[PDB]
Amino acid sequence: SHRKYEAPRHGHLGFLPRKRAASIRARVKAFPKDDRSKPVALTSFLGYKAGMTTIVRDLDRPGSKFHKREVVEAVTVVDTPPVVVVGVVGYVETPRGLRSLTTVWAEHLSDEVKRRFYKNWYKSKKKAFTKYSAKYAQDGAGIERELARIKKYASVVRVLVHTQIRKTPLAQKKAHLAEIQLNGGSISEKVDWAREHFEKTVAVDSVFEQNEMIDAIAVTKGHGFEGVTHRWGTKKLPRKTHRGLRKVACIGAWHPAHVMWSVARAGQRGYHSRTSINHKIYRVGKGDDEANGATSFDRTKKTITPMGGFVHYGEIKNDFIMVKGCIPGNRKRIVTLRKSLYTNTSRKALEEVSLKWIDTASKFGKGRFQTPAEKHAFMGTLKKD
Amino acid sequence: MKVEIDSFSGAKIYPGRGTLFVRGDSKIFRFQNSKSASLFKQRKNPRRIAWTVLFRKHHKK
Amino acid sequence: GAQGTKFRISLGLPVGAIMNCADNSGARNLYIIAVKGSGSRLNRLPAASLGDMVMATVKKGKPELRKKVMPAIVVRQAKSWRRRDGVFLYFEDNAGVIANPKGEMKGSAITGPVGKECADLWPRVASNSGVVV
RNA sequence: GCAGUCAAGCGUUCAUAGCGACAUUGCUUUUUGAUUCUUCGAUGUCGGCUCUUCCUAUCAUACCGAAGCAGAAUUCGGUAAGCGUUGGAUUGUUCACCCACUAAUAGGGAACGUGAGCUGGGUUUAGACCGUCGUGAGACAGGUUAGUUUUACCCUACUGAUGAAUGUUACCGCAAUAGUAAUUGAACUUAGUACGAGAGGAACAGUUCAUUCGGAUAAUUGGUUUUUGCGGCUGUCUGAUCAGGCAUUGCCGCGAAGCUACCAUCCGCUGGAUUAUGGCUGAACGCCUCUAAGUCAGAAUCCAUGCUAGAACGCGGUGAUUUC
RNA sequence: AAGGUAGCCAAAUGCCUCGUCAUCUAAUUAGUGACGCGCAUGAAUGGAUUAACGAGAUUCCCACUGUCCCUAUCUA
RNA sequence: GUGAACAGCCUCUAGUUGAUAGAAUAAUGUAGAUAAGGGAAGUCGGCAAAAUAGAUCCGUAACUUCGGGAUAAGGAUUGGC
Ligand SMILES: [Cl-]
Ligand SMILES: [Cl-]
Ligand SMILES: [Mg+2]
Ligand SMILES: [Mg+2]
Ligand SMILES: [Mg+2]
Ligand SMILES: [Mg+2]
Ligand SMILES: [Mg+2]
Ligand SMILES: [Mg+2]
Ligand SMILES: [Mg+2]
Ligand SMILES: [Mg+2]
Ligand SMILES: [Mg+2]
Ligand SMILES: [Mg+2]
Ligand SMILES: [Mg+2]
Ligand SMILES: [Mg+2]
Ligand SMILES: [Mg+2]
Ligand SMILES: [Mg+2]
Ligand SMILES: [Mg+2]
Ligand SMILES: [Mg+2]
Ligand SMILES: [Mg+2]
Ligand SMILES: [Mg+2]
Ligand SMILES: [Mg+2]
Ligand SMILES: [Mg+2]
Ligand SMILES: [Mg+2]
Ligand SMILES: [Mg+2]
């Protein structure tokens, strides 16, 4: 018979299965539509999530109660040192989908990228790309031959880039290699752009700008095996329940004589691929610029790193991106930032954001001081000094 | 922005930090953290708590 | 008859809660039986916050105000809530005032502080309120 | 229980806006009977709780046709099950009946879904009481009170997790197929305008928030304490002091990190093809007709874009490939 | 053979029945107080009333709370 | 020793140190716990849990077989020197 009362279903059936992601680096399954009448540029960037903090700004929103008044918002900081271009790839349209035709690599590769090709780097002879480098030892006819093939046949061009993991406070020492699609210009222009940027660095400010909506792609934090109560949010059973109460009481009717796929079950929680869209950039930070955490109103000389450093991450010594709100993934995890797939004009975008203050108090406790100078001025001299 | 002062300890309160309490007599109290708020609720005298600004002023520290 | 909208405030007064009477209508407490504009979800109790209009019955006070259903407006909330300027605040008690469906107050004076959100939404409450927040 | 045909009449006039007598044709298996085919070397028996999916005879939401449709409100009908359909008092209740919120509080199926999922209030063992009946033992589809709810480690299904063999190994990719998601309301303005004698009183565009749901996240606020981190307190023990043991975490205050909450914050995309319906051109039928050929616009519908998984017997690119 | 007296009651005894009125609640098939042609109350098959007592059966109120709104966290 | 106490808690004499172990800390359990705002809206039903608690002083209703009800209800105080 029909259920006594109606209620919405628990959970979303479009995020199935709730299994572990294949790789710790989330895949980019879509790129913005190419506009050939624009200069060649990257469509995404790679970075590492450092932590969160707080900012204060004025609200520019006519018709709102808090119009022209200060608001407090949470932001996420992503450490983004420049990436290095080390190759290009051409794709050909086929009735069976896109197919990669040829890959061309740069003449010299640093040990960061080479570590990605080894599981036992300390024991290896480090022979990777030794014979391939000989293709450059000649005039370069072999390299030029493959570049002409990409120009002649390919319809989609992507560049192989890797992060400079040594510039972060992480201990991995092995770089992350990924493909980024090039938008703008003809196929020949894309190949020429990739060729000139071999062994060069591309900075994050050349990809993104201020007040721009971007998408974050990452793997969420893992929690292992989880019961149905927290994995799916089902109602807890009464206290009187025998054999346990953090369960689903009825998992199916007599017919069909099977457990259905749409019934909540215990299993892995977390470590899934997610794509979150419409995150506004609040600041594009400069690594070599002192007073990263300074605004036109605060005027104090302080970097973006809070006192004591970001918890479990460290200090920010490179360029960074400040993103409004929260982002999937935990600290120290590699994340991919991608441009939007459509032109958003909901007046939530197109708003000019000007920060007034950036919080730099310690996140390791109930921090009270923004800078060491403030602590000394408030407390005076101590026995230690 | 504007920096507030803790009503119990005299510590500076930056935006978003602590809680604000309104008493029955419409008097506003501000606390930088839950430590001073808890001590305020326990009817503790700030002048007898050694690490407060009021204590240091009273004893000329 | 709300004069505008209200940003969301944490709910702290579900159905069955009893709050003090903040006006001079003769009632002493208000017993909440419903919340105007509440949604529907299985097993979820309707709940009210500062500035909401509720349906209430007087449990203690003048006998002429007892044993009947009347609208009321919450003016103080003990549950902490966050304003859009980043401040978490709360009052010492929960209080309300008797009103008609149009928003006019049955009494003529309000004792104690009144939340800023309630005053902006209901002009009649603001007129009879002495100190806001 | 639900739906048709006919049309005497109702409807100020007027059969069919909305209804409709006397008759008559069906559909349904969410009622109850009729029957006794299956089960008495046993298929756990009422209701509620929990959870998934399906049906449409559609309560609400989207788009339309009709009216005895001026406006507002309402009524009849079409395409439509995409998306929702609640909180309580009394009762074991199904049912029923009121209070209240709401866009709305529509009806049903899945062994009258669901007891190795729960619960055990009711019915339906043994104790006991009352009324009527019986000489009596006892009876009562009458009332009342107390009454043990067992087992999964197997197979399959489902949820997650490994993995032999495709020269070896490593990195970067393709996308067959399967899944898929958002939802509804209010205020301001339009506007005291259209409409109307008046009383009354809209709508499209625009703006700001909210409801239900979903996916993440921990800067902040709150919760949690074996950080047994610091301090305090009682009894006892180490001669006193210092510093400690024991009291199954002794107790109390604060308490970082981690985890976590509409009790916290952030985010939830836009193109095509259609249904109903309204049209164009235009015959059949010299006229006329949205239809027959052809064709335009069109719904919360459908397919894609996007999002999740990646065939462990689907596939491509690229690096290095061993001498005792 | 005599035709239910004194009392008591929709009571653990009333079928009709969720009886009627009042009270209690925003709302009560519950509770209590009344009414009685009572299917089928009733006098040691004992009637009516009773202070104290009860791991007996019921209704309401105050205090209290993770029973619940709505779940979260810690230890063995 | 504490205390009203053969209560609970700690110690002396005497007696044991026996109950398969090691590593890890998922879900679900069993046992022990804590929770913001609300306070029985949960449920057949306040089931379970929480609250109360020693002692001294003050104060104590209806009813009653005059014996009770009674620790009724309701308040204050408590260390060390
Ligand atoms: Cl879903
Ligand atoms: Cl557990
Ligand atoms: Mg969640
Ligand atoms: Mg049990
Ligand atoms: Mg922290
Ligand atoms: Mg036969
Ligand atoms: Mg069976
Ligand atoms: Mg059996
Ligand atoms: Mg059944
Ligand atoms: Mg069973
Ligand atoms: Mg079963
Ligand atoms: Mg079974
Ligand atoms: Mg029973
Ligand atoms: Mg029996
Ligand atoms: Mg049992
Ligand atoms: Mg494969
Ligand atoms: Mg009687
Ligand atoms: Mg009676
Ligand atoms: Mg006699
Ligand atoms: Mg609590
Ligand atoms: Mg509390
Ligand atoms: Mg109840
Ligand atoms: Mg209930
Ligand atoms: Mg108990």
PDB file of C-alpha atoms (C1' of nucleotides) and ligand atoms in Angstrom, chain D residues 88-89, chain F residues 41-43, ligand 23:
ATOM      1  C1'   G D  88      -0.976  18.930  16.303  1.00  0.00           C
ATOM      2  C1'   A D  89      -5.617  17.592  20.404  1.00  0.00           C
TER       3        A D  89
ATOM      4  C1'   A F  41       5.668  19.218  20.035  1.00  0.00           C
ATOM      5  C1'   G F  42       8.095  12.326  20.727  1.00  0.00           C
ATOM      6  C1'   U F  43       5.122   7.976  22.136  1.00  0.00           C
TER       7        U F  43
HETATM    8 MG    MG G  23       2.340  12.407  17.187  1.00  0.00          MG
END
